[model samples]
Target: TLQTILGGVNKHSTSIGKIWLTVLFIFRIMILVVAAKEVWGDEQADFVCNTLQPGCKNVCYDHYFPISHIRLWALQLIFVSTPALLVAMHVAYRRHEEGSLWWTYTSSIFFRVIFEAAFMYVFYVMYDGFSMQRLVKCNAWPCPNTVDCFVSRPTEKTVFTVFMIAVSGICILLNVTELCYLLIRY
Candidate 1:
């Protein structure tokens, strides 16, 4: 379903724009699907804490992670790609108007740049800068006092987090680059 939109959009873009599409599909979305999802699979089940208290671990985990990284990134990926779908939809609906098509296409690219930058900011604020700490101190209710919480696969998660951030930044740059190319060439 999504692959159709991406492939259709790819057919009409420039070389640099093609690179941007490739990065989004191959690196970001594909990695999120094939690798990142599995890497984060055991987050809730295998979450370790020093305390054996029943509700303490659950409370602490909930406090530290309001939402799972996997879920949040999935939302981000969908939102990021939706503008491309808009372009495709617009193209399909208005093949009769050449001028209107470019206008709609350019606006879609503009929206993508804005959307990507906004997502980066939201993500930065959401995770408090996305650096996963293996050992976290939790002193919430139902716990004796303060206990050390060990997150599963912190190093691996850290790598993926940073990789996603890097890929996002690159995608933004690519979008702006393509925008420049589009304006200058057209």
Candidate 2:
């Protein structure tokens, strides 16, 4: 009955799916939190180079300075991490299906794809598109390209960006691992 499927958690919670999904779930939350503080640390001055130069073409180091950046991260955290958290927590029922395991696998994969797509966009664009940009306002004696003062430590923004990318990569791989295990069992 439904009870066996629902209450069977303790019996099948130790499966590989549970193990990997748990890893993704817990680590993703922590990653998003740290990333949250990092992005929020940016100042408008650090983003808009206009203070340094008036009406310069590339006056804005906007690549890293838009409100959309935080929104993207939050969206990924809520949509992707939330599902990962829930699925990992409920992984027991996935293995103890009395009616349809396909539904479980199908929905899991569907969400995984959506989450993975967002993750991939961030991972690829964060480094590649933003590899280099004029960070100065530009003038006769203006400053040249530079890094933002976001982290405010020995680490710096580059390090924080790299950490985010690495965590994103791990999350993507975990999705693949979870999907594999989802199909591998039974």
Candidate 3:
């Protein structure tokens, strides 16, 4: 279902559009599903807080990492890919003519550009920066006081984060290129 829904649209895209599709599927979606999920899967269990207090680990882990990167990236991928799906279904279902099809395609691309940039900015703000810290302080309920917590593979996680950011930058460029191509073609 997922494969056909999105993959069918690539037949109508330009060279840059094809490239954008590849980046979305290969660089973003595939990596996030296979690699990123495993990278963050054990974070909660492996997190060390030097405390045995009940619920302390839960509170501190939540404080240090408000949202897991895997889940956030999953959301970003969903929002980013939906515009593609919109055009695909619009074309596939309605089979519109040239005049109306132009509007649908253009509007989808415009929204895609906005979504990509917006998600990138959200990632930056949520993480507070590109780099990840090995140790962080957490002071919340059910704990004695402020506790130092360490995350395993902070460096690895930071590297993956930067990789995703770079891929997103490329995706944005590809999107703009496709948009201009459409503008000139029509």
Candidate 4:
């Protein structure tokens, strides 16, 4: 009797899992389409152009800009690699029929969700603080008031710097957690 019930439950779970996976794939594709339509702002455009174009030093500051060349490269690496890693793991797990692999996949998705939430919170806090700071002070842009002046103070750059640090720290924590979880499962 127990074996019969367990077999029924496993069959039901497998059916439900396949349905959910199809839904998830459709949703993911929709999200990708929407994200692709989003426009890049001036600062982002500058960062990309500077990094890729030859001798584009004016836009690519070493570390003072909102996103430095090195930091942008790191972000690109993370953004590209994380999804690739997850996909590879999923494919391997499916091929091997491994329950442990599914657990690892779920844990990775959970970590990414948590990390993104924390990073957004940190960015909001730092951005608000910088806005408050800018409210009380004004400085000439391009030094000595001789060139194109900044109407609003540059607060986002500092906020973004702090945000990047928080993001990096979260990524490190996630990587450690992934390693530990994988080790335990193995």
Give me the candidate number with maximum lDDT.
Answer: 1
Off by over 4 Å in 1: 1-5
For residues 74-97, write the lDDT of model 4, one tens digit per residue: 443355336435655455567796
Rank the models by TM-score, top first.
3, 1, 2, 4
- The models' CA-based lDDT, in order, is 0.81, 0.51, 0.79, 0.41
- Give me the overall lDDT of model 2: 0.51
lDDT order of candidates, best first?
1, 3, 2, 4
Consecutive 10-residue window with the lowest summed lDDT within model 2: 146-155
- Runs in model 3 deviating more than 4 A are 1-7
Question: TM-score for model 3?
Answer: 0.88
Per-residue lDDT over 111-138 for candidate 2, one digit per residue giving the tens place of the 0 to 100 score: 8667767666865665454233334223
Of candidate 1, the 10-residue stretch with the lowest lDDT total is: 18-27
Clashing pairs in 1: none
**How many residue-pair clashes does candidate 2 contain?**
0
lDDT score of residue 134 within candidate 1? 77
